[PDB]
Design a protein around this ligand. Structure first.
Ligand SMILES: [Ag+]
Ligand SMILES: [Ag+]
Ligand SMILES: [Ag+]
Ligand SMILES: [Ag+]
Lengths: 146, 148
């Protein structure tokens, strides 16, 4: 079941990465307009955090409602259950989930991927996008059995 | 336990889809035409969800373009035994058209379905009934694989 859970998330992340890549390289729109559009889409997922990094490795944008996920990417553990690799496990940060009162499932465990995105300057992608998807529901199911 | 867990995964996704589309269809600043245009723009982007919107008389006003109207499969709907509470159904159709071929092609013909009243009120009753169907084929592929 662990490999199945990894495949579920990888499918989701593949789709999310395609959507956000297209957003960040949408023709005839400024950076401001693209980041506004991206934030609205990311907010719509409700179980996703992102961070956008420049060529030096400085964060130009990250999602509200949580600390920058780049503060947890350097101690990310490679995911053993992801065949093909390039998927990482994050032990934080905790994401705020308002609107439901007390007892909502905690979102502080993630599967992470990253890819080059954004307009080319020149022929070369300016940004690197980090995408984190909550895996806490997976981890609670596994922990509750044992 | 894993079947019940798969149901709860789906129910959670359906809850969020329900809340998003509910806001869209009774958004205070917009006309009914603008709201439906917003619905269609959002819904067309879905990879694994079909929806159908019925009017006051139970006639379909809108449904997703990738497949036949899911309300045509209401007559074959089975209560979801793994959904322990509420009104969740299992549909064994329709097939949703998906892009690509080979290993990359997504086979989507099995659904968990819910419905709710939606839209602005007329005579103290919402004008629409929204039907939402989420793909469960990946759940079934896993279970059928274990059974050999
Ligand atoms: Ag969250
Ligand atoms: Ag899970
Ligand atoms: Ag589909
Ligand atoms: Ag599954």
């Amino acid at each position: 079941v662990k490999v199945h859970f990894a495949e579920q998330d990888i499918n989701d992340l593949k789709e999310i990465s395609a959507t956000l890549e297209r957003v960040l390289n949408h023709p005839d729109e400024t950076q401001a307009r693209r980041l506004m559009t991206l934030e609205d889409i990311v907010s719509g997922y409700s179980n996703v955090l992102i961070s956008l990094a420049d060529s030096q490795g400085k964060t130009v944008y990250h999602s509200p409602g949580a600390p920058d996920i780049r503060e947890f990417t350097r101690d990310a553990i490679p995911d053993k259950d992801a065949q093909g690799g390039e998927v990482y496990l994050l032990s934080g940060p905790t994401m705020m989930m308002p609107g439901h009162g007390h007892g909502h499932m905690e979102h502080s465990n993630w599967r992470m991927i990253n890819l080059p995105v954004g307009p080319l300057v020149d022929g070369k992608p300016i940004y690197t996008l980090y995408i984190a998807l909550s895996i806490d529901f997976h981890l609670h199911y596994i922990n509750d059995l044992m």
